Ligand binder design. Structure first.
Ligand SMILES: COc1ccc(S(N)(=O)=O)cc1
Ligand SMILES: [Ca+2]
Ligand SMILES: [Ca+2]
Ligand SMILES: [Ca+2]
Ligand SMILES: [Zn+2]
Ligand SMILES: [Zn+2]
Length: 158
């Protein structure tokens, strides 16, 4: 499927979850992009205005695409594969409780997964992989991509 055909990728944070400190939202998203730029030729920059490649949105229920959210639990987030317009965009369910830690749903960990989709990755059948469909908390301070995630992303880039 689709991949970004350029090395400098931009992201924009459309709006901020009230569940977290603003600076923590910013850092969790930055860190999540870094996971992917660590293992590809990609470079990601936050822009504050105008059109980004990847728009990060928090929203609940019906929010203007074809992927209605479902309240607390169930689908936590979803994102669009590379492409123009909504392509690349990552949407986080406001009905989750977003956090920096193991409480609620960890924003960083979810963002690593969603950004994987934003870059062109589908789900992994390997429970060890970040791209495995089921959310399971792992220590964010020592987080590492599975071998499965690395071969997947490296099949698309670099
Ligand atoms: C690790 O990150 C995630 C993010 C989302 C989901 S899901 N498919 O909405 O339950 C699973 C894992
Ligand atoms: Ca949900
Ligand atoms: Ca986009
Ligand atoms: Ca919330
Ligand atoms: Zn959406
Ligand atoms: Zn997914």
């Amino acid at each position: 499927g689709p991949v970004w055909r350029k090395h400098y990728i931009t992201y924009r944070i459309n709006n901020y979850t009230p569940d977290m400190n603003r600076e923590d939202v910013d850092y969790a998203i930055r860190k999540a992009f870094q996971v992917w730029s660590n293992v590809t030729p990609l470079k990601f920059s936050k822009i504050n205005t105008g059109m980004a490649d990847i728009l990060v949105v928090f929203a609940r229920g019906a929010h203007g695409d074809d992927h209605a959210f479902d309240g607390k639990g169930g689908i936590l987030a979803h994102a669009f594969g590379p492409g123009s317009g909504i392509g690349g965009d990552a949407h986080f369910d406001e009905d989750e409780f977003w956090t920096t830690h193991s409480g609620g749903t960890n924003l960083f960990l979810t963002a690593v997964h969603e950004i994987g989709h934003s870059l062109g990755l589908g789900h992994s059948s390997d429970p060890k992989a970040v791209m495995f469909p089921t959310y399971k908390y792992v220590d964010i301070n020592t987080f590492r991509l599975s071998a499965d995630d690395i071969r997947g992303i490296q099949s698309l880039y670099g």
